[PDB]
Amino acid sequence: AMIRKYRYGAPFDTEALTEKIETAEEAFPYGEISQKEGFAFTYIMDEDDIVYGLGESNRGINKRGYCYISNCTDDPIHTEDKRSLYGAHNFIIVSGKTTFGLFFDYPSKLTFDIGYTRMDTLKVSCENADLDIYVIEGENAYDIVKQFRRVIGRSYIPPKFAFGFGQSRWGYTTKEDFRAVAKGYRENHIPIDMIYMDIDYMQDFKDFTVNEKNFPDFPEFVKEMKDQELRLIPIIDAGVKVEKGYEVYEEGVKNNYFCKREDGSDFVAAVWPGDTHFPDMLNPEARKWFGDKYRFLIDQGIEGFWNDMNEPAIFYSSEGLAEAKEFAGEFAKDTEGKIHPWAMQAKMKDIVNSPEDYKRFYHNVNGKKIRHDKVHNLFGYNMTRAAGEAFERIDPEKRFLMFSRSSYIGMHRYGGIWMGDNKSWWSHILLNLKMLPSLNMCGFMYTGADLGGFGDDTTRDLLLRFLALGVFTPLMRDHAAEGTREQECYQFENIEDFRSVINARYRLVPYLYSEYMKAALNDDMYFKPLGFVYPDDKMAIRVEDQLMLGNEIMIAPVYEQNARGRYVYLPEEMKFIKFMPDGSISEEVLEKGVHYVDVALNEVPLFIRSGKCIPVAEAAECVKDIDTENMQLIGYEGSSYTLYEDDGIHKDYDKKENYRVLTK
Amino acid sequence: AMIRKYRYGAPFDTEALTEKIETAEEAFPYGEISQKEGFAFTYIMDEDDIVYGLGESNRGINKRGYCYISNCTDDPIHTEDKRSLYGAHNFIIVSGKTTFGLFFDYPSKLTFDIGYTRMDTLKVSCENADLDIYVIEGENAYDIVKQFRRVIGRSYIPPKFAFGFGQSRWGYTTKEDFRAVAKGYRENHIPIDMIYMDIDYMQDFKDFTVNEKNFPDFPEFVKEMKDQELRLIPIIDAGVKVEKGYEVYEEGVKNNYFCKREDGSDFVAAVWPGDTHFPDMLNPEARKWFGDKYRFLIDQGIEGFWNDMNEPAIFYSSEGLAEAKEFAGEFAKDTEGKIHPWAMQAKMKDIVNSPEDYKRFYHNVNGKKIRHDKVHNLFGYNMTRAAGEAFERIDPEKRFLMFSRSSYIGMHRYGGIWMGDNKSWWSHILLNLKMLPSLNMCGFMYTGADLGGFGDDTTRDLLLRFLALGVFTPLMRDHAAEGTREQECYQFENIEDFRSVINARYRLVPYLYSEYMKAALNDDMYFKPLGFVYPDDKMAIRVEDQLMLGNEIMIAPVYEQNARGRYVYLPEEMKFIKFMPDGSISEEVLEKGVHYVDVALNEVPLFIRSGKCIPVAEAAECVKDIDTENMQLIGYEGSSYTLYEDDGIHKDYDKKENYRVLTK
């Protein structure tokens, strides 16, 4: 009764929602619907309206003034130019004099023109009128989000160790690479729980193998790491290498588990291993088979994974490569200047993640052949679902770490989100901040971004500022990609500043975990925009560079180079808190209003709300060793905090003993 | 006295300074000089030191924390990744407990590592120890700037009409195109003084021609425009088209005025016309010849120009094109998969502005051949000098509008700077703002940036905010480049908002021109960092998103999308002023300290300093029609302002009649 569902045509069943909603037969309640040239929803907005939503999408909290396309893609350009990121999160809320939420349950290319063409006009459009549109009513945006969170089902919950800090690098290959990382952190007493394994740990980039020469007794090495409280977290890619004798490949061909061309041959896309096939993630039998393959690593002591390249990414197809070679041949023998080098450059760019390639293969959905482009935004979702369901079959009571690159609403139940590569961009700290609440609205709470680097561009201060935001993001890792400067926390001058920043994370782990758990278990938000907490404050609702976390605190990271502080707006009285590099905590009461606050590179700030408190533990070097017995309470005298704690390993969420009232 | 020159090896004479300084004999006074690896200057900075300078370079006012390379280049990437912009402005100031200025008079690739490799270390290096280093002493940074501005000679002074507003588009090609612009502005009462003519006005991209089909009676059409106070401002490119019977080409060939390969053949570079030659800008006779060609346009009633592609840009050379086609044939025939599409992409990119190509041609300086890479950063500078010197021979009494893409210190005497293309990037509003004072320190005051757009990405609010900073920048124009959305002011909803912003510029023209003229004639800055004006205020010295203009005002543009205001810091009491859309001016006194100020999309903000006032004219539609007789004075009751005003056309600067004291 606060949710209606309007059905057009014959929508594909995405499983985004867990709750059944009856089909509405009355007029569509807002704006205008046109089925004239495909499908379009058009709404004229009031001047003061704010538009929230779109989860993993470009620009700010208020989405007005740009165009967003839901179309899972890895576009090799600066973020500022992107129409589309990796996620398709089709939920928006119009908030103003008239407030309502909309979820467009549609698996293919969906365009949100949000005041881009005409400032007062919101237009949502797609090529086929085959979708469900859910309309959600409420008295405010926050109320609407909670109703949405209920129907899409409980968010993924990670094991507690995943609330520690993790290091990786595209390039760690040998046992010695990993041993050096373990020594570097542990001997310098920098806290760490995880080391990520990028694609080089495989045999020739083959999913569900390990390099035999580099890791002859892999389970013993996993144990060697685990004995020092270091959990190895390996990558799994969408593409399965074409190679005779490789079991995964052989099984997939024999059992028709790969995506097929129109003639029924297995589609070939080049990725890391050269030629690959994609498992048919929309086929239930194929899903169960692919997910079951994770047993290979679980049986060796691995407790978490990440899924990558799962748009699916395509460097080129056999068809695209042939066209490119053909065109290059014309270029080569052109003497009359008919083919310009820039037409040559465009052709080469064009074969990567090509729209034409996405219509060259099909999914077998319960016996019905569906062209991939029609359901493109479901692929990464279904890959992560395959793994999640397999974990449930393997060990239904154990939590595994799991996160994905590509996603769609529904996937939030199975794993978290890798938000993107910040490379060495100062601009991206603020972009990460803005995206966090929007992701929470769509069910994705376990999220964080990479600072992959770019040449030597990651300076000491960029990393420290990035990590000080990372303190608060459930996924906190330092993982080099294109960066060539050594970027582990022990590789820079004045190592103590890095230790101070990571210490703050570990001191806050009990609180951050508690807040995550309470929010996940009650279908609520971890990060919130200020406007959700202070809806009557016209200043608060426009703030895009601070966030509320749980019900106790506000964050406001420094995101400018060479800055020694920043401006903040406090909507109520708050205690300005800083974790200091000597292990102390500075505290200052600041009244409602505008402030400039000082924040050094080695300082981690936050603000505790009036009438609230948080528990703070002493710094420990791993999650297991955190002393939660008698934590310091920080904030206002006389306040209480409800601490959630469990074993962090299993799914015994409903024990009364999980909850403890603390009082300052 | 306060400036010493240190000479290394045999430096090329760049003619950057007009003042002759003697070669010092003593040890270099700061840091360490090394010649082991070419040339290197190394300085250990105090933690609190700030580094100013580098004119047109990336990032902020404080240059610490990054690497900057002086190497004039058009790099086709997002600005955030750029090591090098279009200018080479080799002046830095170290400001702190120890303060000093350095000018590196070196015409080739010069690397500024300002705390990038190691946080406390400033390293300046180049391949060849053949340069002059000027050390400038002084009590503070501003004092050092003024010293430097004295010895480099007086900045270029534009005609007054160039302080109006200008519209252009890559694509205006017919009389009808220009007439529609004129009608679109004039019928809607939007002020304007200039229409730019991009490359389509030429006959087949040939310099010093006009398209014969589109402009058969060009003098008449120039007058048609001028009778409406619209001055046409055509572009000139560095590359002269290779074409039989084209007189500029034929004369360049016959008289050896083009840059040559080492064998003496005329070097070929492809740009807009296809194959071109580059005029040998460092040969004095070739300079005279090239500059004299501007007479063709001046004789038709043209009063200003812009020089472009003058790095010089090279799409490809004949040598690069052949290597590319050879590699393409290899790729085409590759059956064993040894040549990947990304190696082919890399090859196509590599032939554009190739460092190899810059080593392939030579300048002839009075018989002496010099390889272009050795003097690369002087090309645009000398092109603009050629035009500047020709104007003096053609009509010595008259000012001409002149600005350039590429530059080096010394060029500031001859023309202004086009700061770059913001495309449709919100991030570039702040980038523009930060660059302004640094350009001013190096002598370049007539400056502004473009919002050339990108597909349809320039939205209404972006253009409004861009124009509202543009109000204060001496070069103010709306010029579409890559943008495909119509972006003239009359092409959006609610034209009145665009009229309001542009009205604010025309009301401020007498003040802005006055301050420019005072600054230029006294070798002073037009824009200043807050720290230059409030050097004992610790907060003021770190402010980077606000500028002082002259001695009366402070500017603080809104640079965030969907923002309804912004934070500011006031180092003294000021009057916060806004030009309102109804033609009124609102005033509010704000005390020293931190404030949040409301600024709507259609409002132009500024602040008047305690004890100061400025004159504001009533809105007029062209510079000619501005009534400067009875302007209201805005600001503080006891105060006065010295107005500089001349005829805006000639070069009679000295006279007492140019000054009048206005008293509030």
Residues 272-301 of A with CB under 8 A from B: 274
Residues in B touching A459 (Cβ below 8 Å): 65-66, 115-116, 119
Angle at A481 between CA A480 and CA A484, to 5 degrees: 75
Rounded alpha-carbon distances, angstroms, from residue A577 to A191, A490, A580, A608, A630: 22, 27, 9, 7, 20
Report yes or no: A562 at the B interface, CB cutoff 8 Å: yes
Give the C-alpha separation, A126 to B231, whole Å: 46
Give the C-alpha separation, B69 to B56, whole Å: 11
Residues B306, B308, B311, B314, Cα dihedral to 10°: -170
Tokens of A521: 């278990």
Q: Do domains A1-154 and A538-664 have the same CATH topology?
A: yes
Report yes or no: A98 at the B interface, CB cutoff 8 Å: no
DSSP B317: E
The residue in chain A having the minimum alpha-carbon distance to the alpha carbon of residue B322 is: A332
Q: Which amino acid is at B277?
A: H
CATH class of this structure's domain B1-154: mainly beta
Angle at A532 between CA A530 and CA A535, to 5 degrees: 90
Indicate the helix (H) or strand (E) that contains B486: none
Quick one: how far is CA A191 from the chain centroid? Answer: 23
Q: Which amino acid is at A655?
A: K
Name the residue with tokens 């160790």: A161
Give the C-alpha separation, B322 to B275, whole Å: 14
Give the C-alpha separation, A627 to A643, whole Å: 14
Residues near A216 by Cβ (< 8 Å), separated by ≥ 6?
none
CB B230 within 8 A of CB B195: yes
Q: Do A345 and B341 touch (CB under 8 A)?
A: no
Give the C-alpha separation, A341 to B347, whole Å: 10
Name the residue with tokens 């806290």: A191
Report yes or no: B659 at the A interface, CB cutoff 8 Å: no
Q: Other CB atoms closer than 10 Å to residue A78's CB: what's the count? A: 18
What stretches of B522-632 show up as alpha helix (H) in DSSP?
530-533
Report yes or no: B115 at the A interface, CB cutoff 8 Å: yes
Q: Other CB atoms closer than 10 Å to residue B656's CB: what's the count? A: 6
Q: What radius of gyration do chain B's Cα atoms show? A: 25
Q: What radius of gyration do chain A's Cα atoms show? A: 25
Residues 50-79 of A with CB under 8 A from B: 59-60, 62, 64-67, 77-78
Residues near B413 by Cβ (< 8 Å), separated by ≥ 6?
B18, B152, B153, B154, B155, B156, B388, B443
Q: Which amino acid is at A182?
A: A
Name the residue with tokens 């229409």: B195
- DSSP strands (E only) in A310-400: 316-317, 362-365, 368-371
Secondary structure string (H, E, C) spanning B212-269: CCCCCCHHHHHHHHHCCCCEEEEEEECCEECCCCCHHHHHHHHCCCECECCCCCECCE
Q: Do A321 and B341 touch (CB under 8 A)?
A: yes
Give the C-alpha separation, A442 to A103, whole Å: 10
Tokens of A220: 């013993």
What stretches of A255-377 show up as alpha helix (H) in DSSP?
284-292, 295-298, 318-333, 341-350
Give the C-alpha separation, B194 to B160, whole Å: 12
Residue A258 zone, left/alpha/beta (φ > 0; ψ -120 to 50; rest): beta
Indicate the helix (H) or strand (E) that contains A221: helix A218-226
> Given the DSSP bridges, would you call strands B91-95 and B87-88 parallel, antiparallel or unpaired?
unpaired
Residues near B380 by Cβ (< 8 Å), separated by ≥ 6?
B72, B86, B238, B307, B310, B311, B312, B404, B405, B406, B407, B408, B411
Q: Residue A248: phi, psi to the nearest 5?
A: -55, -50
Report yes or no: B343 at the A interface, CB cutoff 8 Å: no
Residues in A touching B542 (Cβ below 8 Å): 562-564
Q: Residue B282: phi, psi to the nearest 5?
A: -95, -5
Name the residue with tokens 């590359």: B239
CB A150 within 8 A of CB A18: no
The residue in chain A having the minimum alpha-carbon distance to the alpha carbon of residue B115 is: A459
Give the C-alpha separation, B191 to B507, whole Å: 11
Q: Do A341 and B326 touch (CB under 8 A)?
A: no
Please give the span between the terminal C-alpha atoms of chain A, in angstroms, as a whole number.
42
Q: Is A60 exposed, middle or buried (0-12, 13-18, 19+ CB in 10 A)?
A: buried
Give the C-alpha separation, B555 to B561, whole Å: 18
Residues near A48 by Cβ (< 8 Å), separated by ≥ 6?
A96, A97
Domain extents in chain A: 1-154, 155-537, 538-664
Give the C-alpha separation, A583 to A322, whole Å: 61
Secondary structure string (H, E, C) spanning B12-34: CCCCCCCCCCCECCCCCCCCEEE
Give the C-alpha separation, B367 to B283, whole Å: 9
Give the C-alpha separation, B73 to B70, whole Å: 9
Q: Is B561 helix (H, G, I), strand (E, B) or coil?
A: coil
Q: Is B330 exposed, middle or buried (0-12, 13-18, 19+ CB in 10 A)?
A: middle
Choose, out of B61, B542, B562, the residue to mutate when testing the contact with A (most A CBs < 10 Å). Answer: B562
Residues near A143 by Cβ (< 8 Å), separated by ≥ 6?
none
Q: Is B11 exposed, middle or buried (0-12, 13-18, 19+ CB in 10 A)?
A: middle
Tokens of B480: 């579409």
Give the C-alpha separation, A106 to A11, whole Å: 7
Give the C-alpha separation, A173 to B528, whole Å: 52
Give the C-alpha separation, A175 to A181, whole Å: 10
CB B297 within 8 A of CB B305: yes
Report yes or no: B318 at the A interface, CB cutoff 8 Å: no
Give the C-alpha separation, A617 to B88, whole Å: 53
State how far residue B459 is from chain A, nearest Cα, in angstroms.
6
Domain B155-537 maps to which CATH number in 3.20.20.80, 1.10.3720.10, 3.40.50.970, 3.90.260.10? 3.20.20.80
CB B137 within 8 A of CB B148: no
- Candidates A157, A165, A158, A162; CA nearest to A619 is A165
Residues in A touching B117 (Cβ below 8 Å): 456
Indicate the helix (H) or strand (E) that contains A224: helix A218-226
Tokens of B147: 């010293």
Q: What length is written for chain A? A: 664
Residue B277 zone, left/alpha/beta (φ > 0; ψ -120 to 50; rest): beta
Please give the span between the terminal C-alpha atoms of chain B, in angstroms, as a whole number.
41
Residues in B touching A457 (Cβ below 8 Å): 81
Q: Is B531 helix (H, G, I), strand (E, B) or coil?
A: helix
Report yes or no: A602 at the B interface, CB cutoff 8 Å: no
Experimental resolution (Å): 2.0
Tokens of A460: 């000491």
Name the residue with tokens 């080049």: A270
Query: Is CATH 2.60.40.4040 the classification given to domain A538-664?
Result: yes
Q: Do B80 and A81 touch (CB under 8 A)?
A: no
CB A45 within 8 A of CB A121: yes
Give the C-alpha separation, B642 to B633, whole Å: 12
Residues 119-178 of B with CB under 8 A from A: 119
Report yes or no: A80 at the B interface, CB cutoff 8 Å: yes
Q: Residue A634: phi, psi to the nearest 5?
A: -120, 135
Residues near A109 by Cβ (< 8 Å), separated by ≥ 6?
A69, A70, A71, A126, A127, A373, A376
Q: Residue A271: phi, psi to the nearest 5?
A: -135, -150
Give the C-alpha separation, A316 to A326, whole Å: 14
Diameter of chain A measured on Cα atoms? 84
Rounded alpha-carbon distances, angstroms, from residue B503 to A199, B452, B527, B584, B585: 59, 22, 21, 11, 12
Report yes or no: B331 at the A interface, CB cutoff 8 Å: yes
The minimal CB distance from B493 to the residues A118, A274, A325 is found for: A118
